[PDB]
């Protein structure tokens, strides 16, 4: 009881509890092309503070701000995996969809990279089952769908008070996302690096939860 309150409140006093700062770097993102975006006419109006500048009509995303967002995003994902939460990966993009799905299969967390049905997060008991525990966190690797509209599950998670981590490009909407990271979701090295960082974050969180659980067991 009190020791369970201790094991829940222990990682919240340490900023670097899961030691994720050594996972990535500015050169690591730059070699995997996170700093590129679409054309300057495609720039959404909410991406001007997150844009460093424009290189010959092409948007350049500031990876200092991307790393500053991504440290907090990975730390939040690690803590929500530590507290035994339900984590859902969503990316409506048919070029990596098998790779998101295999990524979630190796993570042990769940994925919806197919068509999102309309009343899924909202009208959960009719679609899924009589008593269904809602997801505790969603990562959007792509916040846009195939017809270049913002994703339905972002709005549905905002309705259902479900926190999210979203990779927003220069044409995306970071307004509804509580933890956005301004980055590139089109280049395969960037997408694979984001999947690898979320993989090692989930694995580190679950293994550290197991070790502190074993420490709690050997305490008494």
């Amino acid at each position: 009881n009190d020791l369970r309150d201790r094991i829940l409140s222990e990682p919240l006093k340490h900023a670097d509890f899961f030691n994720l700062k050594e996972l990535f770097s500015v050169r690591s993102l730059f070699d995997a092309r996170v700093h590129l975006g679409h054309k300057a006419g495609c720039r959404h109006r909410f991406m001007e503070p997150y844009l460093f500048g424009s290189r010959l009509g092409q948007d350049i995303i500031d990876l200092e701000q991307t790393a500053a967002h991504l440290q907090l995003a990975l730390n939040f994902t690690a803590h929500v995996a530590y507290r035994e939460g339900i984590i859902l990966f969503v990316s409506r993009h048919r070029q990596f969809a098998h790779l998101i799905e295999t990524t979630a299969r190796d993570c042990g967390e769940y994925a919806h990279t197919r068509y999102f049905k309309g009343g899924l997060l909202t009208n959960a008991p009719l679609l899924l089952g009589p008593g269904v525990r809602l997801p505790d966190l969603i990562i959007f690797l792509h916040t846009l769908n195939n017809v270049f509209e913002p994703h339905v599950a972002v709005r549905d998670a905002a309705k259902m008070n479900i926190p999210t981590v979203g990779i927003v490009d220069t044409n995306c909407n970071p307004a509804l996302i509580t933890y956005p990271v301004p980055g590139n979701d089109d280049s395969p090295p960037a997408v694979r690096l984001f999947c690898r960082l979320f993989q090692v974050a989930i694995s580190r969180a679950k293994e550290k939860r197991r070790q502190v659980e074993a420490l709690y067991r050997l305490q008494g």
Partner: protein
């Protein structure tokens, strides 16, 4: 620790300048029976047609040469707030890695 402006200053894409008439080597990562999906490494893959000569030696992982015209094909039509990306690049085949 290197700053990000220094890395932008020495990136090859900054050294590219214009995207028109640039000779860039690329790598093919997916084979469709007439369509070659080539990742030249900038942002997007380009799609080319298989040439009638030496068409057997264009496989997965094969390195080719390209002449870039547009790094991303994107236009404005009337009645559109935002431009229409095609999520592709425009490049034509010259040959494959003459060595």
């Amino acid at each position: 620790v290197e700053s990000f402006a220094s890395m932008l200053r020495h990136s090859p894409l900054t050294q590219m300048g214009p995207a028109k008439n640039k000779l860039v080597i690329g790598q093919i990562f997916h084979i469709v029976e007439d369509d070659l999906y080539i990742d030249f490494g900038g942002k997007f893959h380009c799609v080319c047609k298989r040439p009638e000569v030496d068409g057997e030696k264009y496989q997965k992982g094969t390195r080719v040469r390209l002449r870039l015209l547009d790094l991303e094909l994107t236009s404005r039509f009337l009645g559109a707030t935002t431009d229409t990306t095609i999520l592709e690049a425009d490049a034509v085949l010259l040959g494959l890695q003459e060595s």
